[PDB]
Design a protein around this ligand. Structure first.
Ligand SMILES: O=C(NCC1(O)CCCCC1)c1cc(=O)c2cc(O)ccc2o1
Ligand SMILES: O=C(NCC1(O)CCCCC1)c1cc(=O)c2cc(O)ccc2o1
Ligand SMILES: N[C@@H](CCCC[NH3+])C(=O)O
Ligand SMILES: N[C@@H](CCCC[NH3+])C(=O)O
Lengths: 502, 501
C-alpha cells in the first residue's frame, strides 16, 4: 500500500536515470479508441493488417499473460475498451528488451502502444503491438471496481477514482450536460437573452437563506455571496430586455444533506408580461418535454432507498395537480388558520398545531416560518408526482405580487417532485411602496434572529421606482432536477465535487 | 426632482382610492411590437382597420399634443417603436374621461393601449387608440438619452437606466451572448463535456492572485472563493473524461481598473493528449472564426481612447506572431539574462534593468515577478495584433510542464491583444514529484510576503499520483474578449453590474 507508492517513485527515478521514456510531452494517437472500434470492430476473427501501423492510448484496465513471450492488456479511453496483444516476436527491440519494456507497466497506468490492427482468433477487437510507452504511471494500487474502495465516500472525496472505475458516474455528468443544453435551447428558441449578474453582492437577497460573508480589501467593503440573482435580474426587465435567464451558482451558508449542498446550480428567468398562470404552463411544457427527451416517456422510475428497494413511478403527464397552500394545511389540520395569518393569534395557534402534530418548531416562531413547517408536514408530503403548491401567503413571500383574488395571498407557486422543491416562481411584485414595507418586515425578522431574512435593499427599491413592467419570474434547482432525471437519491451523485464533513 | 417623486406617489394613492387601475396583474398583448411592425409596416399612408382591435404595450418614450383632444405617444418595446394616436373621438369613456385617463400617463411609464392598426397620413406606423392603461409608473424624471444623466457612471450604478435609454449598451450584451454561444458550439462539436467545479474551496489555487475569504458556519471552516478552476478540472482528466470545459466566474480580491473586475467570466478547457502547440492552433481557429462571424472580416477597429480618438485596426489573420518570452526581453535589453534565471545574480541584474528602463519594481522581488515586469515592458507592448508570448520560465509557471527542448522554460503561452492578456495555456505538468516541489517553492514565496502565491494543495498532488495523461489546458477571459469584439476600452461596458468605488 504505502510500499507500492514508494517503489513506484523509485521505478520512475530509475527510468529517468536510465534515459528511458519519462513522462513524454506528446503522444500522437492515430485515432481514438471509439474510432478504432468503429473501423475494425466488424473484421473477421483473426484478421490482421500488417501493412498499417497505428498508435493508440488509454488507461490499462487489465494485464494477463500466457508466457514470458505473450502479454494481453486491456486499455480504456473515451468509453471504449481495446485489447492489446504483445508478442515478443513483434517487439521493436530499439525501445528496449521486451521484458524490460513490459515490466514498467502496471494496471492503472496511462500508456501508448503502436502496432497492427485486427481481431484475435477468439474475436476480440485488438491491436497487435510492436511497442509500449509509459505516459503517466499510477502510483497507487487500484481496485477493479468501486466496490473495492475503502469506503463509498471515497467516490466523492476523490471523484477521479469514481470516474475512472464507474460508468454510472460518468453517465450522470453526461446526462446533466444534455439536460442543460435542452433547457438553454428551449429558452433561446423563445428569444431569451442569457445574462450574468454579480455573485459578489453589497446586499444579499432574493431568497430565504443565510449568506456567506467576505471582504474586498482594496475597496474596503464587506460583500456577500449571492443567495439568488433575482434582485439583479429584475433590474434588467426595468431596463427593457424583456426576456432574460441566468444559469449558475447560488451560495447558501447552511447544513448539508441528501438534497442540500452549500453551492448549487440554479436557473432563473424573468419574462415581461407573464403572470404565474403563464409560468405554470411553461413549467409543464419545459419539464415534461425534457423528461420525454431523456426517457422516451412521461413516466419514469425513482428509487428513494436505492436500486434494490421499492420503485415509484413518477408521472409527468400534464396538467399537474395544484394544491392551494392554506386550504390544504386546513384540510390536514381539520380546522382553519386564524386571520390575519400574521396575527399573534395565528402564530399562537400554529405553534399549538405544530405541537399537536409533533412538527418541529422553527426559530424564531414567525408566521412565515410556522406556515412553512405546516406546509412541509401537510402539503409537500402529498407531492409525489410533479405538483404545484400555489397561492402562498404574502407574509412568507416578500417579492411576490398580491393575489388578484385572494386576500393575504400572492401569485406564487412552487413545484414539488417526490416531496422536494424543484421550482419557485411568481407574478413579480412591482409596486414600490409595499415592496419597501415587506423589506422592512424582513429586516425586523432578521433583527429578531431570523438568519434567513434579508436586509432592505434600497438600490432595488429605487429600480422599482423606475417602473418594473408586469413580469413573471421563476427559478429551478438544476441539481435536484438531475436527481429525478437520473434516479439518484443523493445530491452528491450529481455534483462532481460535493461538500463533505470532516 | 424630489417633488416629482412624492407627487407621483400621491397620484398613485389617488388612483387607488378612486378605484381606477392600480398596477394590473396581467396585460394580454395581441402581439409584440416587432411583430406589429412586420405586419402593418407596409400598409399605405392613412390606412386604418377599424375592424381589428389590438392591445400593445411598451415604455412611453414620447408625449406630444396638438390639442386637449389629440395626443401622440411613442412606446418602445423589444427594440421597436410604435406611435400611438389618442383622439378623444375614439376614447372609450367606460375607462374614464379622456383627460383623466391621459393625465395619469408620463414619459417613462410602462403602459398598455387598445385600438385600431394602421398608419398616419404622414406614413408613421401607428395604433389609433381607444384606451390607455397605466401598468407601471416611473416615479422619476428621465432624460431622453444618456447625455442627460447627472454623470456617465450612473450608467453602471443604475444599469437599468443605461439599458432603457441606450441602444449601444443593449447591443453589447446581445453580442456577448452570441459570442459565448459560438464558443460553446465550437467545443460541443469537438465532443467536449461542459462541467461545473466548486467555487467554494478549502484551498485556493491555479492562478497568481489574492483570494476572497469566507466561512461556512455549520462546518466551522474557512473557505476561499476560487481564483481559477484548474486544479479541479485536471482531476476530471485523471478521471478519464478526456475533453472538458467550464465557463464561469473567477474571484480575485484585487484592485479594479479598465481591464480588471473582482469577479470575471473565464473559460477553461482540458484536452487529453494535446500539447501547447495543438492549443495554439485551436486558439487561432476558434478566435479568428468568431471574429469573422461577428464582423464579417478578420480586420476590426479598436479605439483605445474612445470613439473620437485614434483608431487601430486589429488583424486576426492566422497564423499569429509568436514571441519567445526570454529572447524578446533580451532583444529589448540588448543583453542576456543571467542563468539560472532564478539565481540571486539574475534577480540583482533584473532589478538593475528595471531601474535602468524605469520599470516599477514588484514586491517581493522574486525572479518570477521581475521577469513579469520585464515581459510587461518589452514584450506585451509588441502585441497589437493577436500574438502569442511563449515558453515562459518555470520559475513563473508552477503548473506548466518543462519545455521538452529549452532548459528552465515551460510549454506555455499567453495570447495578447492590444497589449492585454486574453488567454493563458500550457502543456500541463503531470509529474507529481516536481509539481510538489513547485508548490513548496510557491508556499515559501507566500510566507516571504508574495500575496499572489498559493498554498500547497495535497489533494491535487495525490490526484496526479493516480496518473494525469499528457494533457493540454487553456483559459480565456471572456470579458476582455467582448471588449475587443465590441470595441470597448472599459470592462464596465461589458459587465452588467460592474464593481464601483
Ligand atoms: O435546488 C434547490 N432548491 C430549489 C430552488 O429553491 C428552486 C428555486 C431556485 C432556487 C433553488 C436547492 C438545492 C440546494 O443544494 C440547496 C442548498 C441550500 O443550502 C438551500 C437551498 C437549496 O435548494
Ligand atoms: O480576462 C482576464 N485575464 C485573462 C486570463 O488571465 C486568461 C486565462 C484565464 C483567466 C483570465 C482578467 C479579467 C479580470 O477582470 C481580472 C481581474 C483580476 O483581479 C485579475 C485578473 C483578471 O483577468
Ligand atoms: N429567487 C427565487 C427564485 C425565483 C422566484 C421568482 N422571482 C429563489 O431562489 O427561490
Ligand atoms: N488557471 C489559469 C488558466 C489555465 C492555464 C492552463 N492550465 C489562469 O487562471 O490563468
Amino acid at each position: 500500500g504505502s510500499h507500492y507508492t514508494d517503489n513506484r517513485y523509485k521505478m520512475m527515478e530509475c527510468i529517468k536515470d536510465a534515459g528511458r521514456p519519462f513522462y513524454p510531452h506528446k503522444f500522437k494517437i492515430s485515432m481514438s479508441l471509439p474510432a478504432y472500434a468503429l473501423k475494425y470492430g466488424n473484421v473477421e476473427n483473426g484478421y490482421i493488417d500488417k501493412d498499417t501501423t497505428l498508435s493508440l492510448s488509454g488507461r490499462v484496465t487489465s494485464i494477463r499473460s500466457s508466457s514470458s513471450k505473450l502479454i494481453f492488456y486491456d486499455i480504456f479511453c473515451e468509453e471504449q475498451k481495446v485489447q492489446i496483444i504483445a508478442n515478443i516476436m513483434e517487439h521493436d527491440i530499439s525501445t528496449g528488451e521486451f521484458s524490460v519494456s513490459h515490466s514498467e507497466i502496471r494496471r492503472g497506468d496511462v500508456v501508448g502502444f503502436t502496432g497492427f490492427p485486427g481481431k484475435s482468433k477468439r474475436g476480440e477487437l485488438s491491436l497487435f503491438s510492436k511497442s509500449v510507452v509509459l505516459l503517466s504511471p499510477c502510483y497507487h494500487m487500484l481496485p477493479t471496481a468501486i466496490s473495492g474502495l475503502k469506503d463509498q465516500e471515497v467516490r466523492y472525496r476523490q471523484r477521479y477514482l469514481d470516474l475512472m472505475l464507474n460508468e454510472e458516474s460518468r453517465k450522470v455528468f453526461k446526462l446533466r450536460s444534455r439536460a442543460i443544453k435542452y433547457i438553454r435551447n428551449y429558452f433561446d428558441r423563445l428569444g431569451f437573452l442569457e445574462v450574468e449578474t454579480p455573485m459578489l453582492n453589497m446586499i444579499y437577497g432574493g431568497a430565504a437563506a443565510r449568506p456567506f460573508i467576505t471582504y474586498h480589501n482594496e475597496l474596503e467593503t464587506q460583500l456577500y455571496m449571492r443567495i439568488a440573482p433575482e434582485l439583479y435580474l429584475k433590474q434588467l426587465i426595468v431596463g427593457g430586455l424583456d426576456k432574460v435567464y441566468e444559469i449558475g451558482k447560488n451560495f447558501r451558508n447552511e447544513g448539508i444533506d441528501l438534497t442540500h449542498n452549500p453551492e448549487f446550480t440554479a436557473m432563473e428567468f424573468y419574462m415581461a408580461y407573464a403572470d404565474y398562470y403563464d409560468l405554470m404552463d411553461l413549467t409543464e411544457e419545459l419539464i415534461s418535454g425534457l423528461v420525454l427527451e431523456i426517457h422516451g416517456s412521461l413516466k419514469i422510475p425513482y428509487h428513494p432507498d436505492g436500486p434494490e428497494g421499492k420503485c415509484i413511478e413518477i408521472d409527468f403527464t400534464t396538467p399537474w395537480k395544484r394544491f392551494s397552500f392554506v386550504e390544504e394545511i386546513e384540510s390536514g389540520l381539520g380546522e382553519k388558520l386564524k386571520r390575519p395569518l400574521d396575527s399573534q393569534e395565528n402564530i399562537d395557534f400554529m405553534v399549538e398545531m405544530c405541537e399537536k402534530h409533533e412538527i418541529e418548531l422553527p426559530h424564531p416562531r414567525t408566521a412565515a416560518k410556522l406556515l412553512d413547517k405546516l406546509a412541509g408536514h401537510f402539503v409537500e408530503t402529498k407531492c409525489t408526482n410533479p405538483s404545484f403548491i400555489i397561492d402562498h401567503p404574502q407574509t412568507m413571500s416578500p417579492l411576490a405580487k398580491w393575489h388578484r383574488e385572494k386576500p393575504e395571498m400572492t401569485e406564487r407557486f412552487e413545484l414539488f417532485v417526490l416531496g422536494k422543491e424543484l421550482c419557485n416562481a411568481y407574478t413579480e411584485l412591482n409596486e414600490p411602496l409595499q415592496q419597501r414595507k415587506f423589506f422592512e418586515q424582513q429586516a425586523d425578522a432578521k433583527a429578531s434572529g431570523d438568519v434567513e431574512a434579508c436586509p432592505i435593499d434600497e438600490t432595488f427599491c429605487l429600480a422599482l421606482e423606475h417602473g418594473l413592467p408586469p413580469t413573471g419570474g421563476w427559478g429551478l434547482g438544476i441539481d435536484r432536477l438531475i436527481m429525478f432525471l437520473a434516479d439518484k437519491n443523493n445530491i452528491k451523485e450529481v455534483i462532481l465535487f460535493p461538500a463533505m464533513r470532516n
